[PDB]
Each structure stands twice: as structure tokens, then as C-alpha cells.
Amino acid sequence: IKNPWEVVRQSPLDDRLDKLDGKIPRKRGAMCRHGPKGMCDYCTPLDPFNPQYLEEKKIKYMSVHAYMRKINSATNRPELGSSFIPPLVEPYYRVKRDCPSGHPQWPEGICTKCQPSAITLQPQPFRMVDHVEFASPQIIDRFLDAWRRTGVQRLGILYGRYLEYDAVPLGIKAVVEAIYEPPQVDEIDGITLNPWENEQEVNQVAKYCGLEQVGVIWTDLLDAGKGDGSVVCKRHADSYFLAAQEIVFAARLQAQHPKPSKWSDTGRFGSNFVTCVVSGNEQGEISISAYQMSNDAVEMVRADIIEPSADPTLMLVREETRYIPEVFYRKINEYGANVLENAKPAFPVEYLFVTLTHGFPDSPSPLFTDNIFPIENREYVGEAQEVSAVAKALKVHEADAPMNVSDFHLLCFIHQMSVLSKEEEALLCRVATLHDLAESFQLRSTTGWQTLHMILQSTG
């Protein structure tokens, strides 16, 4: 039957991004030997993957689409349908199953036709998302209220959508709207989760709101003890950037969130799921470092290969079911040479992440404008989820007052109340995200929101 890339379906953004070359058109350059409708070696339009263009624009890696249009010819294109080669290959560092050479499975049998290859941890030449647009500082300033009251760290989940980021060519931006937090037992240097219980529920809110789990955020905010918000400069050049337990644990969640792709052999490639670490700069102000594991770093967690050390910069190679061949990493020495060092038993963790930029809009107009809810799983600071706030939050005993539901924490609490049905809550999350007046007037005339009135006109 068909290919996966003949049955999988891209995102609408991936539908938007395919119809563009992303080519950067030069005008008549230096060594033009032509009239103005001629060309020379120096007035061609440019590439999205052009390294001199990425160097002058200080752009670290090309986008995954700029990677896509680099590695593939234009003719090899899925609108052919049947005759299409997916240029992307999701890594398969597990074990060649169903081996066609007479020997048993991987277990009990091995030959050359079933073994995977030894890993060359180069830097990944591309990344998925380039910019991390936090849609409001009030998204953050709400979120960092737990740390200012306690001082211990905080984990969250990035919600939102992926849009075009036009500053870099073919840039995808992680527009961030919302954060939900599962039950968890919080400590200082590490965090261990409790299992998340309403897994279909909060995901249904994003399905209502038109959001999804677009990534993960957590914090590394250790106040440096001078009372301003300065940190111990701990995530920088000399120390490290990513804790290696954070790398594996995010790659656990990143394996839980791949992205379907019409350009890859499984019909899926990479991951929409991204990673952010809130920290502090050298200047003593609350900064953010955004990353994502490489497609090897996902696979070596999927194929159970690497392991953290006591040194956060060193990553251990696991000793011996499975198959652990060489790992390398290409270097640049002090005269530019590329030396693949033996990564057994340990190696730098540099070759596993990609760097991302991060920021804000010029003026905050997110899909959420309201902030009225005490955050879940904080009964250790007395910040709980009770029904009694809705008399002041949605203002239902003050029955004239308009709709303050523009709050994802509260929208999940309304979804925790689970009163509005699947069409009326998608009429709520219609009005909770778009705020139409005649549709608020429709929702204030719907039965279930008037049921949500008349139930909460009789509470205390």
C-alpha cells in the first residue's frame, strides 16, 4: 500500500513553507559583465543554506527547511507522488530487525546486515525552530512567581503554535502562549515528576484553543544572594550550558513528540517539541537559554546509548541485547583540523544541542489577555485549585459582568470543572481565544454557559 509520506499529513505551516524557495535575490553585484538583464558569477539570487550568508547574518545553523532544500534536488518533490524519494532519514541506531541473512533476530543472531553504524557526533548542521517568541512578558512574569516566593526551581510545558519567523530565512518560530504543569515532587538541583493524570484533558483544551504541546520550559534560576536577581554564572562558556540529566529527560519527552513529515522515510522527521531554560546572564538579569536535542541525541536515548556523568560537560558511553559501537566527535584544534576523538568512555556534551534565539513581540497581542488563576500542584505553598474563585474569576454571582476566561490556567480549570460540552467549550475556546462579541452574545445566550451561569449563581 502507500508510503507514509503518501498517507501522512503535514501541518498547515508545513503546507505554507513548502511553496517558497526562500531564495535571496541579489541585484547586479560586483563583476557584472552584462547588461542589467544579464548575470555573472556575482549577481545570482542566494541560497537559504548559503553559509557566507549565514555567517554575515551571524546565523548559527540553517533551518530544517533550508536543510531540506539544500540536501534535495527540486525535482525530487512529493507532488510527484509515487516517484518521490524522501531526502530526510530519521536515524535508526537501534538494531536492524528482521535481518535477511539467516542469522536469528538481533538477540541470538548477528551478522553485518543487521548491525547499526558507529555514531559520528558532529554538530547538527540545522535546527527545527530558530526563534522562541514568548508572546508576552506577563506570560513569564506570572510564571516566575513561584521562584520569587520560594527560590526553588520550576518546570513547565511550552504551549502554542509555530509560525513563520521572517528575520532568518525560512524561520519557524515557537510562539508560546500557555504553560501547564503536571504533578511533581520538586527539589533544588533536579526535579522528579509524579505521573501526569489528566493527559487527555489538558490536551483537549489545546485542541479546543488551537494550541498544542509545542515544547518544554524549565528554569535554572539560582539567585546569587545579593537580592537583585543575579545568578551564579553557571550556564556559560566555562561551566556548561545543559545539564545532562536534563538532556536525557527532555529527549524522553521529545521521543514522545515527533513531527510527521512528507520528506522522511517513516513519514515523520525530527520534533516540533523544543526546550527552554530560564536562567540569568552575566549582567545579573533573568535570561533564557533555548535548545533542543539533536536527532542523534533523540536516537541515542531511543536506542539507549549515552549516560550523564558527574561532570555535566562529560557524557558517559554505556558499557555492555544492545550494541554499542564507537562514538566520535569532530574537533577543531588550534589549526582547524578535524580530529574524531574516541568518545569512549566520555566525551563533551556540546555535540548534542542546537541553539535558538528567543524574545517577544513588539507589542503583546497573544491569544490570552487575562491572568486570574492560582496555579496547580502548589499546595505546598497553599496555592490550590478550588471552585470558589469562579465567583470572582468569571464573575457569575456578579451576573452582569463580562467574560474573563482568557486564561489557559483557568481554561484548564474550567475544563477541570468540565461543564461546557465539546462544542460549547470549543465555543468557549472560540471566545476564549478570539473574543467575538456576537459569539459572546451567543455564548451568553447558549444553554450550557447559562447553565454555567446558573450553577455558579448558587455557589459561595
Binding site: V339, L340, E341, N342
Partner: protein, 550 residues
Amino acid sequence: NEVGYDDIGGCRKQLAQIREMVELPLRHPQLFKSIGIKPPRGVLLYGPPGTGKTLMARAVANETGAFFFLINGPEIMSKMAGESESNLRKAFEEAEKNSPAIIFIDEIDSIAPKREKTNGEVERRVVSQLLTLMDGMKARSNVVVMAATNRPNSIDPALRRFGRFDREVDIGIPDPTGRLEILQIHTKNMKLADDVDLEQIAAETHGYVGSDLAALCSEAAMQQIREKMDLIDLDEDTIDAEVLDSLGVTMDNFRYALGVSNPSALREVAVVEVPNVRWEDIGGLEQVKQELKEQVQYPVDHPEKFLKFGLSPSRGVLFYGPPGTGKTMLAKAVANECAANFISVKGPELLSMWFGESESNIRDIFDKARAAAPCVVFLDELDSIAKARGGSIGDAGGASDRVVNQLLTEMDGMTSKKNVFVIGATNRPEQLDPALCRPGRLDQLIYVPLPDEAGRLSILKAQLRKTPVSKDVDLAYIASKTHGFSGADLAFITQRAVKLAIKESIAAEIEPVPELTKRHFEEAMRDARRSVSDVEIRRYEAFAQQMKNA
């Protein structure tokens, strides 16, 4: 798996060298400190492949109380770029840490070819890493570097220069005495039968290395198992112990194992080997016997009269005469007399090694004979050097070619003080240039005539020393009738007569006669045929009258 002195055998003289070179500076560095000389840190082993060169390393190394640091050839070359040269630096720092230290490097040519004849700069770095780190050592380190190869010529000679490697130690092919000892090493672990005569085996094995002998021991063991395969069922998971106790290797298994693919030794090189023929085995020609007793035995026995008389001898002896006159055996019997070492070199052996271009070995013929002084160098079939260009008539090219021009250098490149001797022999002496017959090169010229009937008597006495001949055999009546027949012809008659005897022996078995009858002879005597024309002799007798006109 851990090697003592007893585990190696036969090459005692070579081990006598290495104990002076390796055992001696380590357990007593004070001796070189007391005498005030530098200990040699340049021990180099070489020889044919598979000759215990790796084995003799640990045979010395495990018999010290010194630290040892093993270093293989292809193991470094297996490594990646830069990292391979790191391990050499990682080698010597540990040895200069643990200062009584032994560094053995097996297969040194793999990490050190010629820098002229190589392609990768990674090879050129690791040579350059080695040349650097050899010189970075100290005499106070008291660290000995050992290296072994099977191709001593493929090495970059900058190692073989002074300060880096000075002690060229060759491991030659052992004698039947020493290889007897080698058989006893492998068979003392083995379970044999009482019929096993290793001395009979060691006599019957002539050009084998110990690897050939170890394969020889392993081969006859398998045939012993092949005899037991009827009593052994392979579907069984464990055979019983009664066939294990009866599993004792017979002498005939080695008789089987001597006629197997095992025999194919490594003998296709320029070898040095003591001969076996003697003066009694060459009948007649006692005049030129004494001439060799004059010309070559007096210098190897008494150089004292020369310095008494202030005169260096003639080192160049040329044998000549008609073909088939035993001229090959003459140099062997005289090296067997005065116990000098012997190197047999034939004509096409020069040429066939020069289609593969082995001419440093031609120099190394003189060098190994210089290493094995006293030694005689025997050049068989000098007409073949002329026949490289057909002859002196030939393809209009004479005897002179690239072979002669090499040999005239190497013959003149010999110190007259050295007792290393060069023996030339041809049967076509007119067809050789006088440039090789030049005084200083080859000035003694010895005609080898046919024997008389008394010589033909003495040959037939000497040839039939190991044959169960009849009692009625009048060899003199044979010697009366054999007149123009060479010594090769007389042996050819016996090969006919034994074949005539086997045409009675196994004929009678199919129709033990261990006697060679007159009826076996008078058939071959009627079938006897002369191989040398007398008009050819009248040439040689005119040369025997006068070749000095040239």
C-alpha cells in the same frame, strides 16, 4: 604462554649475542658504567618470517627483572591519525618512568617503511615520530629498544644508522642439530608413541623454520586423529577417554607429515648453510683438492703467516672445466672441512630475484657472509650470467649486464683483511669477461678435468657408499670400460642400473633383490653413453694449456 630460555632452542649463538646486548646492560649497568662506554640501545632483530623472532623477544624479556613494554607494528598502523603517534609517546614515557625497561617492537617495517617508497604522510609522520623518540632517550634511562622484522631491507635506513639501531642481529635457519632441539620443544608437550625418532626426522628436514616444524608436529597429530576417526563419532558431545589414551602419534604419521603440504618451506632466499659433503665423497682430483687446501684453507686457518710476510692473499678463485664434473660439490666439501659458513648462489637466482629486483640482498650476500665470517660465497652457474644476454655470443650482448656491474662493485667492495671468500664456478669459462677475471676480483682459475679410471674408480667407490651393491661388482672392470664418461655419467649409470634393479625388484613383486648385479650393470654398461665430446675437451685442454692469453 610465558616464555623462558628453555622454550626457545637451537639459535644459541644468537641468544649469546642478545644476553650480551640486553640482559647484560640491565642487570649490570655498572659494567658499562665502570668501563665508561655507552650501552647500545639499538638492538635490531631480523631474519626469515616465522623464525621465533617474536618468540625470542619474550624469551629475553620474561627472563629479566626489568619492565617490559610490548609494541606491535600493525596495532599502531590500525590506529587513527595522530592518535597512533600518541601511543608511541605514551610508550616511552612509561619506559623512562620504569627505568629498567625493555621495549620490543614486532614487525618494525609496518610502522617504518622507506620514506622514499611510501605514500601516506601518516606513515611519514609515524616514522618521523619514531626517529624523534629514539633520539629523545637517555643513557641514564637504561631503556633498551628491541625491534624485529622479516624484511630488513624495507626499513628506512635512518633507523639503521648510528645512535638508533646499531645491533643488526640475524636469526638464521637452524642446522639439523638445532632443529632437533626445536622438535623436542614442541613434542615434549605432545603425547607420542615410542617409534618416534625425532633425530630421524631432524635429519630428513633440511630447510625448515620452527614454524614449519611446529606445523609439522601439528600435522602428524591430525593424521593420528584421522586414524582414530573410525573410533570417534562426531555427533557425540564428548568422546570417551580410552581413545584419548590410545591417541599416541606414530613415527609413520611424521612419515605421512613429511610428504604433506607442510614440507613447502621458505627456502627461496639467499641462505647461509653449513654443507654436508666431504672429501671422501668426491673421488679423485686430489691435486686441486690440495690447491684448495693451499688457497682457501691456509687463510681461514692461519692469517698469522700473512702479517708475518706482509702479503694479502688472492681472495678470488674461479672453478672451470667441462660440465657435469662435480664442481658444485667442491666448494661445499671445503667449507665442510674448515667449518666455514657457506652461501650457495646460482646464476638465475641472481636474475629471478632481479625480476623482483632483490639486489640489496646481493649486497647482503656479502654482508651476511661478513656477518657470518668465516664464510665462503659460492657462485654457481656463471654461464647463466652470460646467458642473461644469451652468452658472450648471445643476443650480441656479452656476459656484462647489470648483474656483473653490481658484482664487480661488491667484489671490489670487500676488505682484503676479511676472511670472507668468493668462489666462482662455471663450465663455459671462455664465455665470461676478463673484467670479472681481473686480479683482485677472480685471479685463481682452477681447471676441473675428467677423472681417469682410477678417479672413476674412486667416484664409483664414493657414489656407492650408501647403496646395497652386489659382491661380484668389478668397479675396475667398469672403470676399464668407462673412459670418456664423466662423474655425472657414472651416477647416471647407477640411476639407470637401480632403475634396472627396480625393473627387477618390483617386477619380481608383480611377477627383495637388494643387490646391484653385473646383469643390472652390463645392461646399463651396454646402454652407457658419453656426454662430453673430446673435441670439446680439446678446447678446455687448450684453456688448461693456456687461458691466461684470455
